[PDB]
């Protein structure tokens, strides 16, 4: 802005930025699989005792 | 010295990281090995100019991505060197190998020079007090809590079933197969050129694999569904480009059981699993029928297990109860089973001291892995 | 030891000059080579037989102006020296060629022979201690501070779509079309004869440029705004006369997007930039809309970027977020970015050492600029 | 039909035309698609407004010359129709589609869509009874008489070695690649701008192509001959305008072996041939070392195959005797080999009965084009 006033070869009424418009897995449930979860803390403390 | 044990998931497809006790792998990222495709002149580019991590995870078409793990077997150790340097990054760990008990994993049947070379790095550059390079299906045994069982794995160019029983020396019955989604997605690039889709780059391959993981199902009937009329699902690219599919989305995973599509002479990992069954015994076979584990990130598909179960039924004996247990997060489950074993303190026998590695190395590897 | 460099922002049509660290190029005037046209008679009649600046404006139709910069590519090297001498003079520099380091601007992919010719000047006739000449787009990026950026900019008789990103040398994607406002002014001269005006002098061409930069713009609709009836804006000539205009004022920059009017197989540099985008990467292309940099005094018009916005809207697909960046000092943005680099000690590695040029020259010149 | 079977010499850059039994393709001409760049307001000018033949092969800058085979992949269809109408021109044929058996040739892995378009043409517009679409390297094997061989084609934007062995379907082993001298000559236009030569027309590009085909070669020593300096021999324009040739004559075709000069990652197709070698088998590799064919117009350069010989010598192991075979009639080898195959009785079973084939859809010969 002050430099815009300084030099003569400077145009005015310039919205310098012009942008466009702006607006705003499934097989874990598969029937044939025997999908298992673990809770590793429990089984870990369980098998943890296996001093092998 | 017993600090927190490092859990090194040696993910060929997607490498994972963190320590034991962590119920989630803290750092997770694939086999990508980049450095810029172009050459920066003006400053503004990042520093290191060999990027792996968020920089690579945000600049795909900018870095020349490469892969040393030919069938999950790294050839450019230099890549791993920088990867392991990045393991202690300011974003990552900022610690020492010296400062921690470390644990490694390994898909069996790899050439001895691989794990020997890796151990050279971790006991020369890095200096681990005690370490061991375990297997990979045991992780899944922890995740399932089982001891008896067939464990299928899935990296990126490696997939195989691992028939186990309480951790017993059955290496003949135990199998290993190095083939997976790497060339399946490359075959998808073949499909692309088959119908004029101009795609050849590695970053372009990453995009292809993302959509592959996204838009690829598994029709249970092979040719009965392969010879149908396809809708050619117009996938709109992340850029926005509309791209159809065809039956190719399920055709490419058939290659994993139809190796003749690429011309490879193989059987289908389920048939190799049946061969492992044959290598086992009638009493133990039934257990394996009841105990099957699918793991590895490449196993993630739509209509995946149902189709493969049907194919097994096509090749299974008379009414034997086929049963496949499954971890929901096949990627996580592995690293987490490794987290369990790392948190398992019976590892005292199972580790390898630094001094021992200096004395024997290969002999210490075999004698401690057997 | 070095001294304060001089940020000299040249160009196809206008040169800007000031020292290092300054905010304003204290010596600005266009790029022209003027010299008398008449028979000198009385005493006091200014000798020198080449005049620039106040003498040029003072003797517009009295001095034959020359423009050897064939789209920036100059041929009157001797006169270039003299232009610099005019700058070297008590008027602008008040110094020597050795008393100060030099900074200069370069348009893309020009013939290296020209650069080398200038180096001969700068280090043999003139004796520059240290210099460096490069892309004006880079300097504009310094002014914007952006590193990731497609720089759309035009000289006076040169247009150039410059897709840059963090200094990455992407000359395949980077383009330039050496034709611009100089020819649009020549096209205005075409309009002059179209309305019967034989004002062909270089000074007459300056008047044309005055009205050009004065009364012209980009109407977003081409023929919906062209085919209608105009008012023929009676531009009051500075002579004290008056000439009407009509739609011609906004019709002239349509040629910049429709080169067929002059009979040129170009595309309207915005489309060339779209092709440059097509030479880039898919999701990175999306960022290029965000990485939109606009410059060029030739491009300083009403609804210029707005019409161009509509152009790209009619060209680019959805999910495209153009982020224009066109300040009021796009001319000086290059000069100010040069002052930024002048404030940078990176020039110590990025110079043009006199000594090495004396030793090798050409090969060293390209080893210095590449 | 009991007439002479037409052999379409569907060349990428130069699409010639002919029959069977003959040893000379009837008419030779490129992908030029001209339409005048002006308006014949004066009566008494020449008609057509679309130009194929001496009309365009005599006047170039007047016509908007076009080229739709995007690396062989044609995008125009209406123009192709007119080209085929011109195939039946007075000088050209004066025959019918029904009156003659026609044989089409194609590059491997092309989109089925193109064949569908061809079916529409020669089955709706044209009505060839005996129409077959084939490959291109098999033709070269017919001409050479070989059955086993590495056929390297050389188009304008298509080059790829075709390792064949007795017609055995090795699509995985055989490699297709679409890149050649088109952008090399365009890259030489980049050189032109770097040497001050304002040329932007396809006609100008054809003049550069005359230099390409004429004053260009492959220097077996890349940088040993590149880092030096030539005297830049002078080429004369259609007017006879003197223009230096320069080192470019060998510098530009190095991109064929050094694809990263344009930035596109590739190998230099000889290494892709090595990849095909890897896909083949050890002693069968030796056969193909002894069996290499060089067809296509772009093979014509000094030390071309010799430089590639040196390349493979820097690639192939010791005691590896390799043999190439470059017939003088490279493009005609495909044409004469097509004449050979079209002159066969077994070849009658290759195509499918015209009307029924239309009713058979396209998948039938799509499966039968292998
Ligand atoms: N939906 C999906 N389809 C196919 N592959 C997938 C999917 N999701 C993830 N992947 C794959 O995950 C794999 C990672 O395998 P991973 O479980 O890390 O095995 P490893 O640890 O042996 O590398 C990658 O090969 C990637 O292809
Ligand atoms: N308001 C304006 N409208 C149109 N053209 C202008 C305006 N101001 C300057 N110009 C012309 O546009 C050119 C500015 O673009 P720039 O890249 O600085 O050009 P150059 O490289 O020729 O100095 C100037 O040379 C000048 O002739
Ligand atoms: N003497 C020559 N030297 C180099 N290239 C040539 C020569 N003659 C013809 N050509 C090239 O032949 C190509 C024409 O493509 P063409 O060979 O017809 O495609 P295809 O290989 O599919 O038949 C162009 O690259 C042209 O430069």
Short mmCIF file of N, CA and C in Angstrom, two decimals, chain D residues 246-345:
data_model
loop_
_atom_site.label_atom_id
_atom_site.label_comp_id
_atom_site.label_asym_id
_atom_site.label_seq_id
_atom_site.Cartn_x
_atom_site.Cartn_y
_atom_site.Cartn_z
N UNK D 246 24.69 -28.01 -36.11
CA UNK D 246 25.09 -28.09 -34.74
C UNK D 246 25.26 -29.48 -34.18
N UNK D 247 25.60 -29.54 -32.89
CA UNK D 247 25.80 -30.83 -32.23
C UNK D 247 24.52 -31.57 -31.97
N UNK D 248 23.40 -30.85 -32.01
CA UNK D 248 22.03 -31.29 -31.83
C UNK D 248 21.70 -32.56 -32.60
N UNK D 249 22.28 -32.68 -33.81
CA UNK D 249 22.07 -33.81 -34.71
C UNK D 249 22.32 -35.14 -34.03
N UNK D 250 23.22 -35.16 -33.08
CA UNK D 250 23.46 -36.33 -32.29
C UNK D 250 23.07 -36.09 -30.85
N UNK D 251 22.97 -34.82 -30.43
CA UNK D 251 22.58 -34.53 -29.06
C UNK D 251 21.11 -34.83 -28.83
N UNK D 252 20.25 -34.40 -29.76
CA UNK D 252 18.83 -34.67 -29.62
C UNK D 252 18.46 -36.16 -29.62
N UNK D 253 18.98 -37.04 -30.50
CA UNK D 253 18.58 -38.45 -30.41
C UNK D 253 19.12 -39.21 -29.20
N UNK D 254 19.95 -38.59 -28.35
CA UNK D 254 20.42 -39.29 -27.16
C UNK D 254 19.30 -39.46 -26.16
N UNK D 255 18.26 -38.63 -26.29
CA UNK D 255 17.07 -38.71 -25.46
C UNK D 255 16.39 -40.06 -25.62
N UNK D 256 16.58 -40.70 -26.77
CA UNK D 256 16.04 -42.02 -27.01
C UNK D 256 16.68 -43.04 -26.08
N UNK D 257 17.92 -42.79 -25.69
CA UNK D 257 18.59 -43.65 -24.74
C UNK D 257 18.64 -43.02 -23.38
N UNK D 258 18.50 -41.69 -23.32
CA UNK D 258 18.51 -40.92 -22.09
C UNK D 258 17.17 -40.20 -22.00
N UNK D 259 16.11 -40.93 -21.65
CA UNK D 259 14.76 -40.34 -21.58
C UNK D 259 14.58 -39.28 -20.52
N UNK D 260 15.50 -39.16 -19.59
CA UNK D 260 15.34 -38.16 -18.56
C UNK D 260 15.72 -36.78 -19.02
N UNK D 261 16.17 -36.64 -20.27
CA UNK D 261 16.45 -35.31 -20.79
C UNK D 261 15.14 -34.57 -20.94
N UNK D 262 14.07 -35.32 -21.24
CA UNK D 262 12.74 -34.75 -21.30
C UNK D 262 12.13 -34.89 -19.92
N UNK D 263 12.78 -35.61 -19.03
CA UNK D 263 12.32 -35.82 -17.70
C UNK D 263 11.56 -37.11 -17.51
N UNK D 264 11.01 -37.68 -18.58
CA UNK D 264 10.26 -38.92 -18.43
C UNK D 264 11.18 -40.08 -18.09
N UNK D 265 10.88 -40.76 -17.00
CA UNK D 265 11.71 -41.89 -16.62
C UNK D 265 11.36 -43.06 -17.53
N UNK D 266 12.40 -43.64 -18.10
CA UNK D 266 12.33 -44.78 -18.99
C UNK D 266 13.73 -45.36 -18.95
N UNK D 267 14.08 -46.18 -19.93
CA UNK D 267 15.38 -46.81 -19.90
C UNK D 267 16.26 -46.52 -21.09
N UNK D 268 15.69 -46.53 -22.27
CA UNK D 268 16.44 -46.44 -23.48
C UNK D 268 16.09 -47.88 -23.71
N UNK D 269 15.11 -48.09 -24.58
CA UNK D 269 14.41 -49.33 -24.91
C UNK D 269 15.29 -50.57 -25.05
N UNK D 270 16.59 -50.38 -25.26
CA UNK D 270 17.51 -51.50 -25.27
C UNK D 270 17.57 -52.14 -23.89
N UNK D 271 17.38 -51.34 -22.84
CA UNK D 271 17.35 -51.90 -21.51
C UNK D 271 16.01 -52.56 -21.25
N UNK D 272 14.97 -52.09 -21.94
CA UNK D 272 13.67 -52.72 -21.82
C UNK D 272 13.74 -54.05 -22.53
N UNK D 273 14.57 -54.10 -23.56
CA UNK D 273 14.83 -55.32 -24.28
C UNK D 273 15.55 -56.27 -23.36
N UNK D 274 16.44 -55.72 -22.52
CA UNK D 274 17.14 -56.52 -21.53
C UNK D 274 16.13 -57.05 -20.53
N UNK D 275 15.08 -56.27 -20.26
CA UNK D 275 14.05 -56.74 -19.34
C UNK D 275 13.29 -57.88 -19.97
N UNK D 276 13.11 -57.81 -21.29
CA UNK D 276 12.47 -58.89 -22.02
C UNK D 276 13.36 -60.12 -21.99
N UNK D 277 14.67 -59.88 -22.04
CA UNK D 277 15.67 -60.94 -21.97
C UNK D 277 15.55 -61.65 -20.63
N UNK D 278 15.40 -60.86 -19.57
CA UNK D 278 15.22 -61.39 -18.22
C UNK D 278 13.97 -62.24 -18.15
N UNK D 279 12.91 -61.79 -18.81
CA UNK D 279 11.67 -62.54 -18.83
C UNK D 279 11.82 -63.81 -19.64
N UNK D 280 12.76 -63.84 -20.58
CA UNK D 280 12.98 -65.03 -21.38
C UNK D 280 13.87 -66.01 -20.64
N UNK D 281 14.42 -66.99 -21.34
CA UNK D 281 15.23 -68.02 -20.71
C UNK D 281 16.62 -68.05 -21.32
N UNK D 282 17.59 -68.36 -20.46
CA UNK D 282 19.04 -68.35 -20.64
C UNK D 282 19.59 -68.68 -22.01
N UNK D 283 19.28 -69.85 -22.53
CA UNK D 283 19.78 -70.18 -23.85
C UNK D 283 18.89 -69.62 -24.93
N UNK D 284 17.61 -69.46 -24.63
CA UNK D 284 16.68 -68.85 -25.57
C UNK D 284 17.00 -67.38 -25.68
N UNK D 285 17.61 -66.83 -24.62
CA UNK D 285 18.09 -65.46 -24.64
C UNK D 285 19.15 -65.33 -25.70
N UNK D 286 20.05 -66.31 -25.77
CA UNK D 286 21.15 -66.31 -26.73
C UNK D 286 20.65 -66.33 -28.16
N UNK D 287 19.54 -67.03 -28.38
CA UNK D 287 18.94 -67.06 -29.70
C UNK D 287 18.50 -65.67 -30.09
N UNK D 288 17.81 -64.99 -29.18
CA UNK D 288 17.36 -63.65 -29.45
C UNK D 288 18.50 -62.66 -29.48
N UNK D 289 19.65 -62.99 -28.88
CA UNK D 289 20.80 -62.12 -28.99
C UNK D 289 21.24 -62.20 -30.43
N UNK D 290 21.26 -63.42 -30.93
CA UNK D 290 21.57 -63.64 -32.32
C UNK D 290 20.43 -63.22 -33.23
N UNK D 291 19.24 -62.99 -32.68
CA UNK D 291 18.08 -62.63 -33.50
C UNK D 291 17.49 -61.28 -33.10
N UNK D 292 17.99 -60.21 -33.70
CA UNK D 292 17.46 -58.88 -33.44
C UNK D 292 17.14 -58.23 -34.78
N UNK D 293 15.94 -57.67 -34.89
CA UNK D 293 15.47 -57.03 -36.11
C UNK D 293 15.27 -55.54 -35.85
N UNK D 294 15.64 -54.71 -36.82
CA UNK D 294 15.49 -53.27 -36.73
C UNK D 294 14.63 -52.77 -37.88
N UNK D 295 13.39 -52.44 -37.58
CA UNK D 295 12.50 -51.93 -38.60
C UNK D 295 12.08 -50.52 -38.20
N UNK D 296 11.20 -49.93 -38.99
CA UNK D 296 10.76 -48.59 -38.73
C UNK D 296 11.72 -47.56 -39.29
N UNK D 297 11.14 -46.44 -39.72
CA UNK D 297 11.94 -45.39 -40.34
C UNK D 297 12.96 -44.74 -39.43
N UNK D 298 12.63 -44.55 -38.16
CA UNK D 298 13.54 -43.88 -37.23
C UNK D 298 14.81 -44.67 -36.90
N UNK D 299 14.98 -45.86 -37.45
CA UNK D 299 16.21 -46.60 -37.23
C UNK D 299 17.36 -46.04 -38.03
N UNK D 300 17.06 -45.27 -39.06
CA UNK D 300 18.05 -44.75 -39.98
C UNK D 300 18.93 -43.64 -39.44
N UNK D 301 20.05 -44.01 -38.82
CA UNK D 301 21.01 -43.05 -38.30
C UNK D 301 22.39 -43.68 -38.35
N UNK D 302 23.42 -42.84 -38.39
CA UNK D 302 24.78 -43.33 -38.45
C UNK D 302 25.17 -43.86 -37.08
N UNK D 303 25.71 -45.08 -37.05
CA UNK D 303 26.13 -45.71 -35.81
C UNK D 303 25.00 -45.99 -34.85
N UNK D 304 23.76 -45.98 -35.34
CA UNK D 304 22.53 -46.19 -34.60
C UNK D 304 22.56 -47.51 -33.86
N UNK D 305 22.50 -48.59 -34.65
CA UNK D 305 22.56 -49.91 -34.09
C UNK D 305 23.91 -50.22 -33.50
N UNK D 306 24.95 -49.55 -33.98
CA UNK D 306 26.28 -49.76 -33.45
C UNK D 306 26.39 -49.15 -32.06
N UNK D 307 25.76 -47.99 -31.86
CA UNK D 307 25.77 -47.41 -30.53
C UNK D 307 24.97 -48.30 -29.60
N UNK D 308 23.84 -48.82 -30.10
CA UNK D 308 23.05 -49.72 -29.28
C UNK D 308 23.81 -51.01 -29.01
N UNK D 309 24.66 -51.43 -29.95
CA UNK D 309 25.51 -52.60 -29.76
C UNK D 309 26.41 -52.35 -28.58
N UNK D 310 27.05 -51.18 -28.57
CA UNK D 310 27.91 -50.79 -27.47
C UNK D 310 27.14 -50.72 -26.16
N UNK D 311 25.88 -50.28 -26.23
CA UNK D 311 25.03 -50.20 -25.04
C UNK D 311 24.86 -51.56 -24.42
N UNK D 312 24.40 -52.52 -25.22
CA UNK D 312 24.19 -53.87 -24.73
C UNK D 312 25.51 -54.51 -24.34
N UNK D 313 26.61 -54.10 -24.98
CA UNK D 313 27.92 -54.61 -24.58
C UNK D 313 28.24 -54.10 -23.19
N UNK D 314 27.73 -52.92 -22.86
CA UNK D 314 27.86 -52.39 -21.52
C UNK D 314 26.78 -52.96 -20.62
N UNK D 315 25.86 -53.75 -21.17
CA UNK D 315 24.78 -54.35 -20.40
C UNK D 315 24.85 -55.87 -20.35
N UNK D 316 24.97 -56.53 -21.50
CA UNK D 316 25.01 -57.98 -21.54
C UNK D 316 26.31 -58.50 -20.93
N UNK D 317 26.30 -59.70 -20.33
CA UNK D 317 27.52 -60.24 -19.74
C UNK D 317 28.55 -60.70 -20.76
N UNK D 318 29.61 -61.34 -20.29
CA UNK D 318 30.68 -61.79 -21.16
C UNK D 318 30.28 -63.03 -21.96
N UNK D 319 30.98 -63.21 -23.09
CA UNK D 319 30.80 -64.32 -24.03
C UNK D 319 29.36 -64.41 -24.50
N UNK D 320 28.77 -63.25 -24.69
CA UNK D 320 27.39 -63.10 -25.10
C UNK D 320 27.44 -62.58 -26.53
N UNK D 321 27.29 -63.48 -27.50
CA UNK D 321 27.33 -63.04 -28.89
C UNK D 321 25.93 -62.63 -29.29
N UNK D 322 25.81 -61.38 -29.66
CA UNK D 322 24.56 -60.76 -30.04
C UNK D 322 24.63 -60.46 -31.52
N UNK D 323 23.48 -60.53 -32.19
CA UNK D 323 23.46 -60.24 -33.62
C UNK D 323 22.20 -59.47 -33.94
N UNK D 324 22.36 -58.41 -34.71
CA UNK D 324 21.22 -57.61 -35.09
C UNK D 324 21.00 -57.90 -36.56
N UNK D 325 19.91 -57.40 -37.12
CA UNK D 325 19.58 -57.58 -38.53
C UNK D 325 18.71 -56.38 -38.88
N UNK D 326 19.29 -55.42 -39.58
CA UNK D 326 18.56 -54.21 -39.94
C UNK D 326 18.35 -54.14 -41.44
N UNK D 327 17.21 -54.62 -41.95
CA UNK D 327 16.95 -54.57 -43.39
C UNK D 327 16.86 -53.14 -43.88
N UNK D 328 17.33 -52.92 -45.11
CA UNK D 328 17.31 -51.59 -45.69
C UNK D 328 15.90 -51.04 -45.81
N UNK D 329 14.95 -51.91 -46.08
CA UNK D 329 13.56 -51.53 -46.22
C UNK D 329 12.80 -51.79 -44.93
N UNK D 330 13.13 -50.98 -43.92
CA UNK D 330 12.56 -51.11 -42.58
C UNK D 330 11.04 -51.02 -42.57
N UNK D 331 10.51 -49.91 -43.05
CA UNK D 331 9.06 -49.75 -43.08
C UNK D 331 8.44 -50.66 -44.11
N UNK D 332 9.16 -50.90 -45.18
CA UNK D 332 8.64 -51.76 -46.22
C UNK D 332 8.67 -53.21 -45.79
N UNK D 333 9.56 -53.55 -44.83
CA UNK D 333 9.63 -54.92 -44.30
C UNK D 333 8.30 -55.31 -43.72
N UNK D 334 7.69 -54.37 -43.01
CA UNK D 334 6.37 -54.61 -42.47
C UNK D 334 5.37 -54.69 -43.61
N UNK D 335 5.50 -53.79 -44.58
CA UNK D 335 4.59 -53.79 -45.71
C UNK D 335 4.72 -55.05 -46.56
N UNK D 336 5.96 -55.43 -46.90
CA UNK D 336 6.14 -56.63 -47.71
C UNK D 336 5.78 -57.88 -46.91
N UNK D 337 6.01 -57.87 -45.60
CA UNK D 337 5.62 -59.02 -44.81
C UNK D 337 4.12 -59.13 -44.71
N UNK D 338 3.44 -57.98 -44.75
CA UNK D 338 2.00 -57.99 -44.77
C UNK D 338 1.52 -58.52 -46.10
N UNK D 339 2.27 -58.23 -47.16
CA UNK D 339 1.97 -58.76 -48.48
C UNK D 339 2.12 -60.28 -48.48
N UNK D 340 3.14 -60.76 -47.76
CA UNK D 340 3.40 -62.18 -47.62
C UNK D 340 2.24 -62.87 -46.93
N UNK D 341 1.88 -62.38 -45.73
CA UNK D 341 0.79 -62.98 -44.97
C UNK D 341 -0.54 -62.84 -45.69
N UNK D 342 -0.78 -61.70 -46.34
CA UNK D 342 -2.02 -61.50 -47.07
C UNK D 342 -2.08 -62.42 -48.26
N UNK D 343 -0.93 -62.89 -48.73
CA UNK D 343 -0.85 -63.84 -49.82
C UNK D 343 -0.93 -65.28 -49.32
N UNK D 344 -1.57 -65.54 -48.19
CA UNK D 344 -1.65 -66.88 -47.64
C UNK D 344 -3.06 -67.44 -47.60
N UNK D 345 -3.14 -68.76 -47.75
CA UNK D 345 -4.40 -69.47 -47.73
C UNK D 345 -4.88 -69.68 -46.31
#
